[PDB]
Design an enzyme around this catalytic site. Structure first.
Site, PDB file in Angstrom:
ATOM      1  N   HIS A  40      -8.342  -6.595   8.721  1.00  0.00           N
ATOM      2  CA  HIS A  40      -8.075  -5.161   8.633  1.00  0.00           C
ATOM      3  C   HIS A  40      -9.343  -4.305   8.711  1.00  0.00           C
ATOM      4  O   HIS A  40      -9.269  -3.082   8.710  1.00  0.00           O
ATOM      5  CB  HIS A  40      -7.199  -4.802   7.416  1.00  0.00           C
ATOM      6  CG  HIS A  40      -7.939  -4.697   6.115  1.00  0.00           C
ATOM      7  ND1 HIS A  40      -7.898  -5.686   5.158  1.00  0.00           N
ATOM      8  CD2 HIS A  40      -8.656  -3.684   5.575  1.00  0.00           C
ATOM      9  CE1 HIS A  40      -8.555  -5.292   4.081  1.00  0.00           C
ATOM     10  NE2 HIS A  40      -9.026  -4.077   4.310  1.00  0.00           N
ATOM     11  N   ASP A  84      -5.134 -12.210   6.923  1.00  0.00           N
ATOM     12  CA  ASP A  84      -6.123 -11.142   6.968  1.00  0.00           C
ATOM     13  C   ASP A  84      -7.532 -11.753   6.968  1.00  0.00           C
ATOM     14  O   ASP A  84      -8.220 -11.760   5.948  1.00  0.00           O
ATOM     15  CB  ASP A  84      -5.930 -10.215   5.768  1.00  0.00           C
ATOM     16  CG  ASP A  84      -6.742  -8.935   5.872  1.00  0.00           C
ATOM     17  OD1 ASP A  84      -7.293  -8.635   6.946  1.00  0.00           O
ATOM     18  OD2 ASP A  84      -6.827  -8.216   4.865  1.00  0.00           O
ATOM     19  N   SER A 177     -13.279  -4.275   0.789  1.00  0.00           N
ATOM     20  CA  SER A 177     -12.531  -5.026   1.805  1.00  0.00           C
ATOM     21  C   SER A 177     -13.404  -5.910   2.694  1.00  0.00           C
ATOM     22  O   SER A 177     -14.448  -5.473   3.173  1.00  0.00           O
ATOM     23  CB  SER A 177     -11.758  -4.052   2.704  1.00  0.00           C
ATOM     24  OG  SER A 177     -10.737  -3.378   1.997  1.00  0.00           O
ATOM     25  N   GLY A 178     -12.963  -7.146   2.917  1.00  0.00           N
ATOM     26  CA  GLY A 178     -13.709  -8.069   3.755  1.00  0.00           C
ATOM     27  C   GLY A 178     -14.801  -8.821   3.020  1.00  0.00           C
ATOM     28  O   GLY A 178     -15.320  -9.814   3.530  1.00  0.00           O
TER      29      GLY A 178
HETATM   30  C1  LIG Z   1       4.625  -4.474   2.036  1.00  0.00           C
HETATM   31  C2  LIG Z   1       3.576  -5.520   1.769  1.00  0.00           C
HETATM   32  N1  LIG Z   1       3.917  -6.712   2.058  1.00  0.00           N
HETATM   33  N2  LIG Z   1       2.393  -5.164   1.294  1.00  0.00           N
HETATM   34  C3  LIG Z   1       1.248  -6.059   1.328  1.00  0.00           C
HETATM   35  C4  LIG Z   1       0.227  -5.460   2.316  1.00  0.00           C
HETATM   36  C5  LIG Z   1      -0.017  -3.929   2.175  1.00  0.00           C
HETATM   37  O1  LIG Z   1      -1.063  -3.755   1.248  1.00  0.00           O
HETATM   38  C6  LIG Z   1      -1.930  -2.686   1.318  1.00  0.00           C
HETATM   39  C7  LIG Z   1      -2.690  -2.414   2.475  1.00  0.00           C
HETATM   40  C8  LIG Z   1      -3.571  -1.313   2.480  1.00  0.00           C
HETATM   41  C9  LIG Z   1      -3.670  -0.508   1.332  1.00  0.00           C
HETATM   42  C10 LIG Z   1      -4.637   0.682   1.379  1.00  0.00           C
HETATM   43  C11 LIG Z   1      -5.600   0.881   0.205  1.00  0.00           C
HETATM   44  C12 LIG Z   1      -6.469  -0.328  -0.312  1.00  0.00           C
HETATM   45  C13 LIG Z   1      -7.469  -1.002   0.536  1.00  0.00           C
HETATM   46  C14 LIG Z   1      -8.301  -2.104   0.179  1.00  0.00           C
HETATM   47  C15 LIG Z   1      -8.147  -2.608  -1.095  1.00  0.00           C
HETATM   48  C16 LIG Z   1      -8.939  -3.701  -1.506  1.00  0.00           C
HETATM   49  C17 LIG Z   1      -8.796  -4.216  -2.793  1.00  0.00           C
HETATM   50  C18 LIG Z   1      -7.851  -3.647  -3.690  1.00  0.00           C
HETATM   51  C19 LIG Z   1      -7.660  -4.174  -5.081  1.00  0.00           C
HETATM   52  N3  LIG Z   1      -6.925  -3.352  -6.033  1.00  0.00           N
HETATM   53  N4  LIG Z   1      -8.145  -5.325  -5.356  1.00  0.00           N
HETATM   54  C20 LIG Z   1      -7.055  -2.557  -3.294  1.00  0.00           C
HETATM   55  C21 LIG Z   1      -7.172  -2.000  -1.984  1.00  0.00           C
HETATM   56  C22 LIG Z   1      -6.231  -0.761  -1.581  1.00  0.00           C
HETATM   57  C23 LIG Z   1      -4.036   1.995   1.792  1.00  0.00           C
HETATM   58  O2  LIG Z   1      -3.221   2.536   0.976  1.00  0.00           O
HETATM   59  O3  LIG Z   1      -4.456   2.410   2.935  1.00  0.00           O
HETATM   60  C24 LIG Z   1      -2.904  -0.789   0.178  1.00  0.00           C
HETATM   61  C25 LIG Z   1      -2.024  -1.884   0.171  1.00  0.00           C
HETATM   62  C26 LIG Z   1       1.235  -3.104   1.770  1.00  0.00           C
HETATM   63  C27 LIG Z   1       2.102  -3.849   0.741  1.00  0.00           C
END
Ligand SMILES: CC(=N)N1CCC(Oc2ccc([C@H](Cc3ccc4ccc(C(=N)N)cc4c3)C(=O)O)cc2)CC1
Ligand SMILES: [Ca+2]
Length: 223
Positions: A40, A84, A177-178
């Site tokens: 991502h 990912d 991230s990453g």
């Molecule tokens: C529906 C489903 N299967 N899922 C899993 C993947 C997906 O998860 C996600 C994907 C992206 C996002 C981001 C925000 C974000 C990005 C990186 C992150 C990295 C680490 C953490 C953490 N609390 N450890 C939280 C994060 C929150 C955003 O809001 O842009 C949040 C949840 C949606 C929920």
């Protein structure tokens, strides 16, 4: 990193910062010419910055190398974040030394309870935004699959694991991230996602690296 501590300059030699005019993702150096990060985090025009501590000042020890190619896992799903993982090949090999070193891939998966070190330049706040200049660190244990799946019903695949604290207050966050999740000198995870940051009963979710060792090796060998 929320609730973490300042690592100390170059104490996490395998940590990488992905830059496109600003820091947008972390990564891990696995050999002199390859970096592992999250799918991502994919973007064109990536400059890999090694040996970094303060990302806003040139302090010495930095090595800026352009990415020659980024290989996103073919089965990566952007909605579920399953698979990912992304490999980045450097245009030139990095100069490995005391402050810039590679991290080892695991030979076996880690078990629940294993303590790991997570690091990054991501958001340091649960409510709001505050990005650090220097690298932050956090020690966190791998949680049981049961607790992980109870926290995120139907969203945890076999290529993911939870790590952190259910009481909240300490977690990785956006910007991390990453980045690496290192346990016993082995890269076991990649910062992937979570619900908010450092929230009660919502631990961080990480890409389970041990499931990709063969893929990583085969891909590096053919490129
Ligand atoms: C529906 C489903 N299967 N899922 C899993 C993947 C997906 O998860 C996600 C994907 C992206 C996002 C981001 C925000 C974000 C990005 C990186 C992150 C990295 C680490 C953490 C953490 N609390 N450890 C939280 C994060 C929150 C955003 O809001 O842009 C949040 C949840 C949606 C929920
Ligand atoms: Ca800098």
């Amino acid at each position: 990193i929320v609730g973490g501590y300042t690592c100390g300059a170059n104490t996490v030699p395998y940590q990488v910062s992905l830059n496109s005019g600003y820091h947008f993702c972390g990564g891990s150096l696995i050999n002199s010419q390859w970096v592992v990060s999250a799918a991502h985090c994919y973007k064109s025009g990536i400059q890999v910055r090694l040996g970094e501590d303060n990302i806003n000042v040139v302090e010495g020890n930095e090595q800026f190398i352009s990415a020659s190619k980024s290989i996103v896992h073919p089965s990566y799903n952007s909605n579920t974040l399953n698979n990912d993982i992304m490999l980045i090949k450097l245009k030139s090999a990095a100069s490995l030394n005391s402050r810039v070193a590679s991290i080892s891939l695991p030979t076996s998966c880690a078990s629940a309870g294993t303590q790991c070190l997570i690091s990054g330049w991501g958001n340091t706040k649960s409510s709001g935004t505050s990005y650090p200049d220097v690298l932050k660190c956090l020690k966190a244990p791998i949680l049981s699959d049961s607790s992980c799946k109870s926290a995120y019903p139907g969203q945890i695949t076999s290529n993911m694991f939870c790590a952190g604290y259910l009481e909240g207050g300490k977690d990785s966050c956006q910007g991390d991230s990453g980045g690496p999740v290192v346990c016993s000198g082995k890269l076991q995870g990649i910062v992937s996602w979570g619900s908010g940051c450092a929230q009660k009963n919502k631990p961080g979710v990480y890409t389970k690296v041990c499931n990709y060792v063969s893929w990583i090796k085969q891909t590096i060998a053919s490129n």
